[PDB]
Scaffold this active site. Structure first.
Site, PDB file in Angstrom:
ATOM      1  CG  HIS A  48      -2.062  -1.014   1.089  1.00 32.02           C
ATOM      2  ND1 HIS A  48      -3.121  -1.068   1.973  1.00 32.02           N
ATOM      3  CD2 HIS A  48      -2.269  -2.012   0.197  1.00 32.02           C
ATOM      4  CE1 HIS A  48      -3.931  -2.053   1.627  1.00 32.02           C
ATOM      5  NE2 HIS A  48      -3.436  -2.640   0.552  1.00 32.02           N
ATOM      6  CG  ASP A  49       4.857   3.586   1.686  1.00 36.43           C
ATOM      7  OD1 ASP A  49       4.307   4.712   1.651  1.00 36.43           O
ATOM      8  OD2 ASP A  49       6.100   3.449   1.768  1.00 36.43           O
ATOM      9  N   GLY A  67       5.736   6.622  -4.566  1.00 34.37           N
ATOM     10  CA  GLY A  67       6.136   5.229  -4.470  1.00 34.37           C
ATOM     11  C   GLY A  67       6.474   4.802  -3.050  1.00 34.37           C
ATOM     12  CG  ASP A  69       6.589   8.355  -0.551  1.00 32.12           C
ATOM     13  OD1 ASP A  69       6.123   9.337  -1.167  1.00 32.12           O
ATOM     14  OD2 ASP A  69       5.867   7.512   0.020  1.00 32.12           O
ATOM     15  CB  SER A  71       3.602   8.890   1.774  1.00 31.50           C
ATOM     16  OG  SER A  71       3.111   7.821   0.979  1.00 31.50           O
ATOM     17  CG  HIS A 176      -3.044 -12.919  -0.945  1.00 29.92           C
ATOM     18  ND1 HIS A 176      -4.206 -12.717  -1.656  1.00 29.92           N
ATOM     19  CD2 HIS A 176      -2.699 -11.704  -0.452  1.00 29.92           C
ATOM     20  CE1 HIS A 176      -4.524 -11.426  -1.581  1.00 29.92           C
ATOM     21  NE2 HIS A 176      -3.640 -10.768  -0.859  1.00 29.92           N
ATOM     22  CB  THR A 196       0.713 -23.381   5.229  1.00 26.12           C
ATOM     23  OG1 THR A 196       0.751 -23.192   3.808  1.00 26.12           O
ATOM     24  CG2 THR A 196       0.537 -24.846   5.509  1.00 26.12           C
ATOM     25  CB  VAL A 199       4.499 -22.489   5.730  1.00 26.05           C
ATOM     26  CG1 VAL A 199       5.572 -23.079   4.826  1.00 26.05           C
ATOM     27  CG2 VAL A 199       4.589 -23.089   7.114  1.00 26.05           C
ATOM     28  CG  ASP A 201       3.148 -23.138   1.631  1.00 30.72           C
ATOM     29  OD1 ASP A 201       2.281 -22.286   1.341  1.00 30.72           O
ATOM     30  OD2 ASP A 201       3.039 -23.936   2.585  1.00 30.72           O
TER      31      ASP A 201
HETATM   32  C1  HEM Z   1      -2.814  -7.079  -6.794  1.00 29.63           C
HETATM   33  C2  HEM Z   1      -4.060  -7.025  -6.103  1.00 29.63           C
HETATM   34  C3  HEM Z   1      -4.326  -7.224  -4.358  1.00 29.63           C
HETATM   35  C4  HEM Z   1      -5.696  -7.129  -3.702  1.00 29.63           C
HETATM   36  C5  HEM Z   1      -6.963  -6.839  -4.375  1.00 29.63           C
HETATM   37  C6  HEM Z   1      -5.397  -7.469  -2.245  1.00 29.63           C
HETATM   38  C7  HEM Z   1      -6.262  -7.489  -1.215  1.00 29.63           C
HETATM   39  C8  HEM Z   1      -6.196  -7.834   0.142  1.00 29.63           C
HETATM   40  C9  HEM Z   1      -7.443  -7.694   1.132  1.00 29.63           C
HETATM   41  C10 HEM Z   1      -8.965  -7.010   0.719  1.00 29.63           C
HETATM   42  C11 HEM Z   1      -7.059  -8.321   2.295  1.00 29.63           C
HETATM   43  C12 HEM Z   1      -7.948  -8.466   3.517  1.00 29.63           C
HETATM   44  C13 HEM Z   1      -7.594  -7.390   4.727  1.00 29.63           C
HETATM   45  C14 HEM Z   1      -8.492  -7.558   5.843  1.00 29.63           C
HETATM   46  O1  HEM Z   1      -9.776  -7.645   5.702  1.00 29.63           O
HETATM   47  O2  HEM Z   1      -7.751  -7.898   6.870  1.00 29.63           O
HETATM   48  C15 HEM Z   1      -5.808  -8.744   2.111  1.00 29.63           C
HETATM   49  C16 HEM Z   1      -4.862  -9.321   2.958  1.00 29.63           C
HETATM   50  C17 HEM Z   1      -3.357  -9.426   2.891  1.00 29.63           C
HETATM   51  N1  HEM Z   1      -2.681  -9.039   1.729  1.00 29.63           N
HETATM   52 FE1  HEM Z   1      -3.417  -8.500  -0.171  1.00 29.63          FE
HETATM   53  N2  HEM Z   1      -4.186  -7.748  -2.052  1.00 29.63           N
HETATM   54  C18 HEM Z   1      -3.431  -7.514  -3.380  1.00 29.63           C
HETATM   55  C19 HEM Z   1      -1.983  -7.685  -3.327  1.00 29.63           C
HETATM   56  C20 HEM Z   1      -1.082  -7.860  -2.426  1.00 29.63           C
HETATM   57  C21 HEM Z   1       0.428  -7.603  -2.483  1.00 29.63           C
HETATM   58  C22 HEM Z   1       1.125  -7.200  -3.910  1.00 29.63           C
HETATM   59  C23 HEM Z   1       1.104  -7.824  -1.026  1.00 29.63           C
HETATM   60  C24 HEM Z   1       2.441  -7.713  -0.623  1.00 29.63           C
HETATM   61  C25 HEM Z   1       3.623  -8.176  -1.471  1.00 29.63           C
HETATM   62  C26 HEM Z   1      -0.242  -8.303  -0.159  1.00 29.63           C
HETATM   63  C27 HEM Z   1      -0.219  -8.822   1.208  1.00 29.63           C
HETATM   64  C28 HEM Z   1      -1.303  -9.187   1.985  1.00 29.63           C
HETATM   65  C29 HEM Z   1      -1.121  -9.859   3.339  1.00 29.63           C
HETATM   66  C30 HEM Z   1       0.218 -10.463   4.030  1.00 29.63           C
HETATM   67  C31 HEM Z   1      -2.527  -9.872   3.898  1.00 29.63           C
HETATM   68  C32 HEM Z   1      -2.855 -10.406   5.304  1.00 29.63           C
HETATM   69  C33 HEM Z   1      -3.178  -9.606   6.244  1.00 29.63           C
HETATM   70  C34 HEM Z   1      -3.616 -10.243   7.734  1.00 29.63           C
HETATM   71  O3  HEM Z   1      -3.565 -11.589   7.921  1.00 29.63           O
HETATM   72  O4  HEM Z   1      -4.036  -9.378   8.563  1.00 29.63           O
HETATM   73  N3  HEM Z   1      -1.468  -8.282  -0.992  1.00 29.63           N
HETATM   74  N4  HEM Z   1      -5.300  -8.346   0.689  1.00 29.63           N
HETATM   75 CA   LIG Z   2       4.044   5.703  -0.505  1.00 34.96          CA
HETATM   76 CA   LIG Z   3       1.057 -20.515   2.987  1.00 34.94          CA
END
Ligand code: HEM
Ligand SMILES: [Ca+2]
Ligand SMILES: [Ca+2]
Length: 336
Positions: A48-49, A67, A69, A71, A176, A196, A199, A201
């Site tokens: 998000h940042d 980007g 930064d 922010s 994810h 998992t 992990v 994977d």
């Molecule tokens: C490209 C389209 C993406 C969409 C639409 C998306 C969306 C989301 C949403 C709506 C959640 C649920 C948050 C909540 O209700 O707690 C979530 C969780 C998460 N996302 Fe994504 N995401 C995208 C890409 C990415 C990227 C590129 C990263 C980092 C390299 C990321 C890392 C994570 C992580 C680790 C969680 C877990 C958070 C937790 O267990 O509290 N996501 N994402």
């Molecule tokens: Ca930023």
């Molecule tokens: Ca996993």
């Protein structure tokens, strides 16, 4: 080479301050170098940042964003107000202190906390780490973070504009593999995205391709789809990206090898770390990042489900060989 006051050997003097941050984070932020909520929250923060960067906005004659930064921390009052940044207030305030206290830029800290957080989760690759991003940033333009309600086109155009190809979008989503949701369906708070969440994977890619047969909570969230088993949450954007003709083949190849998935992710994360920055202008301190414990387990299709339960979306390419685990079907407990 240089030896820090603490005795650490490193490739540059400016890699020395980082050994104290690494110490701080692991001890407090991560409660003992652990792979739980903090690491998952930080992964949302780094994405998000950095994603608040639009060459297209700039061309249109508007501030496109800075980007990576920092922010989101520097201008949290504005950015944490965005609907996409919900449930991050504490992670941000936690990170802000570390940053000030240690006198490091927020953009560098987020990127550093990410590589460090990844090391706490088994099977994670060793993300590169560059230091030297300016401490000054402006608030990110709104509506730059792709959402689970968005269409594949919407997501790809937004990510493409930022500088990522369809394949790189799939690669970044390997994140994810260590995730859950808290705000999409509050009824089932912290329902994992894969079997998992502790992990790093290929399970995420495998399981999202299984036929959706289960509704884990009292109702199906706004941006939620049927999952393969109890406890697991399936996000609408993930379900669509796995099956879309523009991204299906990459998603498919990301199911068989943990090493390859790790390679592609690292390459993608390294790309995202310098959005709004010049690589040449930053100092490599990748050697400060610790290695994550190995993941010897091999990819498998969960609970008695077979490869025939997979909704193959890239038939033009041979579906990878993957072991199948016997039942019963699993029921995921909430992410720690
Ligand atoms: C490209 C389209 C993406 C969409 C639409 C998306 C969306 C989301 C949403 C709506 C959640 C649920 C948050 C909540 O209700 O707690 C979530 C969780 C998460 N996302 Fe994504 N995401 C995208 C890409 C990415 C990227 C590129 C990263 C980092 C390299 C990321 C890392 C994570 C992580 C680790 C969680 C877990 C958070 C937790 O267990 O509290 N996501 N994402
Ligand atoms: Ca930023
Ligand atoms: Ca996993």
């Amino acid at each position: 080479s240089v030896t820090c006051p603490g005795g650490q050997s490193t490739s540059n003097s400016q890699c020395c301050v980082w050994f104290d941050v690494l110490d701080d984070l692991q001890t407090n932020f991560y409660q003992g170098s652990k792979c739980e909520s903090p690491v998952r929250k930080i992964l949302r923060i780094v994405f998000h940042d950095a994603i608040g960067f639009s060459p297209a906005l700039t061309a249109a004659g508007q501030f496109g964003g800075g980007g990576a930064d920092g922010s989101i921390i520097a201008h949290s009052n504005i950015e944490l107000a965005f609907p996409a940044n919900g449930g991050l207030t504490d992670t941000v305030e936690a990170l802000r202190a570390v940053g000030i206290n240690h006198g490091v830029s927020f953009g560098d800290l987020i990127q550093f906390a990410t590589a460090v957080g990844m090391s706490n989760c088994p099977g994670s690759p060793r993300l590169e780490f560059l230091t030297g991003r300016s401490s000054s940033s402006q608030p990110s333009p709104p509506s730059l973070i792709p959402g689970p309600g968005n269409t594949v086109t919407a997501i790809l155009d937004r990510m493409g504009d930022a500088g990522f190809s369809p394949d790189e979008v799939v690669d970044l989503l390997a994140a994810h593999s260590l995730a859950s949701q808290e705000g999409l369906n509050s009824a089932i708070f912290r329902s994992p995205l894969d079997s998992t969440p502790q992990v790093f994977d290929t399970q995420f890619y495998i399981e999202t391709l299984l036929k959706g047969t289960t509704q884990p909570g009292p109702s199906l969230g706004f941006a939620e789809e049927l999952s393969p088993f109890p406890g697991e949450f399936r996000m609408r954007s993930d379900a669509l990206l796995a099956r879309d003709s523009r991204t299906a083949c990459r998603w498919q190849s990301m199911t068989s090898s943990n090493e390859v998935m790790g390679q592609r992710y690292r390459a993608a994360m390294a790309k995202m770390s310098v959005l709004g920055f010049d690589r040449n202008a930053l100092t490599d301190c990748s050697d400060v990042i610790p290695s994550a414990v190995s993941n010897n387990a091999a990819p498998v299709i969960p609970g008695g489900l077979t490869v025939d339960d997979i909704e193959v979306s890239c038939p033009s390419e041979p579906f990878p060989e993957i072991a199948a685990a016997s039942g019963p079907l699993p029921a995921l407990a909430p992410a720690p």
